[PDB]
Amino acid sequence: RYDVFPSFRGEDVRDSFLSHLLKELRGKAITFIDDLSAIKESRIAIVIFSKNYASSTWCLNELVEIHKCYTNLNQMVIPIFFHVDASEVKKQTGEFGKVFEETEKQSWKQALAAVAVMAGYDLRKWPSEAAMIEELAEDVLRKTM
Amino acid sequence: GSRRYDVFPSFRGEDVRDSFLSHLLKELRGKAITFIDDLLSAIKESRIAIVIFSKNYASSTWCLNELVEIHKCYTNLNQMVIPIFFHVDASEVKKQTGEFGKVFEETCKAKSEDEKQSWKQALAAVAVMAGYDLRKWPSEAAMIEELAEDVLRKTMTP
């Protein structure tokens, strides 16, 4: 059905980083969902790890479902690391750890560890949000044909 | 036909060999990542180029010719290039401005305008690629660890 499923905490990214990503995707004719069982129906899951991704249960459970569609459906998963250390996502250490379960639990740690290591986009390695989002759209678009 | 080296380090010794480069190479060794010991013919023989931009990278035509060649292999042989910005800022390398631009400009005075255009194109193309700016990492150690894991994954590419 869909080209992309986005998993993100709205408070961190919806009005800003996400709007730019979705605009670039749209302009490349990438398909997604305009606001949980839709994940199955999506070829690519773009996961936006932000500072408060670890505070939402809907986020984490969305991620577990994304992880299941990786292992069972060969859903491709692209993690974005948005002002968030990727090692802290993988190891639930530091700031991101603290937020993690101030908030089952082991299925979560398994998803975070699994997706954190995949080929992704670390804003800290990129000159700008605009350029990173550009590369991400071309990677999704050639990942979709 | 397999490539002889995982990594080709392109760097300015005077800046980095005794310090930052020795730590990065130890980390690479520790993950069984191969690299040449020190020349442009080796470059095409490497899966990954790590370009360490430092203050005096700009002052060495051997580095800049290395960079032109890395660029050629990036577009022609699908070579992966990782830039590192070691106490230079990326846009100064990308645009040849400020400190870095000044050293670069001093270097070009006795050189082909043509060569110079090559150097500018390589600098601009590599400087915008995703990479490791030390300003954006907690420490050299932390950055080198992330870079080495990155390089290791990239050796899983077919």
Backbone region of residue B135 per phi and psi (left: phi > 0; alpha: psi in -120 to 50; beta: other values): alpha
Of all residues in chain A, the one with the smallest CA distance to B156 is A119
From chain A, pick out residues whose CB is under 8 angstroms from the CB of B90. Answer: 127
Cβ neighbours of residue A119 under 8 Å, at least 6 residues apart? A78, B153
Torsion of CA A83, A86, A89, A92, to 10 degrees: -110
From chain B, pick out residues whose CB is under 8 angstroms from the CB of A125. Answer: 130-133, 136
Structure tokens at B144: 């080198």
A83 and B CB contact within 8 Å: no
Q: How far away is chain A from the Cα of B128, in angstroms, using its nearest Cα?
A: 7
Query: Resolution of the experimental model in angstroms, please?
Result: 2.6
Q: Which of B68, B87, B90, B88 is nearest to B79 (CA)?
A: B68
Cβ neighbours of residue A13 under 8 Å, at least 6 residues apart? A48, A50, A82
| Residue A40 structural domain | 1-144
Q: Which of A87, A122, A127 comes nearest B90 by C-beta?
A: A127
The phi and psi torsions of B58 (rounded to 5 degrees) equal -65, -25
Parallel, antiparallel or unpaired: strands B80-85 and A2-7: unpaired
Of all residues in chain B, the one with the smallest CA distance to A123 is B130
Amino acid found at A23: K
Task: Answer positive or negative: Cα dihedral of B136, B138, B141, B144.
Answer: negative
Gaps in chain A following residue numbers (C to N > 2.5 A): 35, 103
Structure tokens at A30: 């990438």
How many domains are contained in chain B? 1
Structure tokens at B158: 């077919």
Q: How far apart are CA B138 and CA B146, in angstroms?
A: 11
Q: Which of A86, A87, A125 comes nearest B132 by C-beta?
A: A125
Structure tokens at A67: 């992880």
Q: How far apart are CA A86 and CA A113, in angstroms?
A: 10
Q: How far apart are CA B46 and CA B155, in angstroms?
A: 11
Task: Answer positive or negative: Cα dihedral of B140, B142, B148, B151.
Answer: negative
Cβ neighbours of residue A120 under 8 Å, at least 6 residues apart? A78, A79, A80, A81, A86
End-to-end CA, chain A: 14
A128 and B CB contact within 8 Å: no
Amino acid found at A131: A
Structure tokens at B128: 């915008």
Parallel, antiparallel or unpaired: strands B80-85 and B46-53: parallel
| B46-53 β-sheet, strand order | B5-10, B46-53, B80-85, B132-133
Verify whether residue B92 is a known catalytic residue.
no
> SS3 of B151, please?
helix
Amino acid found at B23: H
Cβ neighbours of residue A25 under 8 Å, at least 6 residues apart? A3, A4, A32, A137, A140
Which technique? Answer: X-ray
Helices B113-127, B98-108: inter-axial angle, 10-degree rounding: 150
- How many other C-beta atoms lie within 10 A of the C-beta of residue A105? 10
End-to-end CA, chain B: 12
Are residues A5 and A38 in contact, defined by beta-carbon separation less than 8 angstroms? Answer: yes
Q: Is B16 annotated as a binding residue?
A: yes
Are residues A31 and A2 in contact, defined by beta-carbon separation less than 8 angstroms? Answer: yes
The phi and psi torsions of A119 (rounded to 5 degrees) equal -50, 120
Q: How far apart are CA A63 and CA A12, in angstroms?
A: 17
Given the residues B27, B66, B69, B92, the one annotated as active site = B66
Are residues B1 and B47 in contact, defined by beta-carbon separation less than 8 angstroms? Answer: no
Q: Domain with A40 in it: what CATH number? A: 3.40.50.10140
Q: Which of B91, B131, B153 comes nearest A125 by C-beta?
A: B131
DSSP code of residue B91: H
Q: How far away is chain A from the Cα of B51, in angstroms, using its nearest Cα?
A: 14
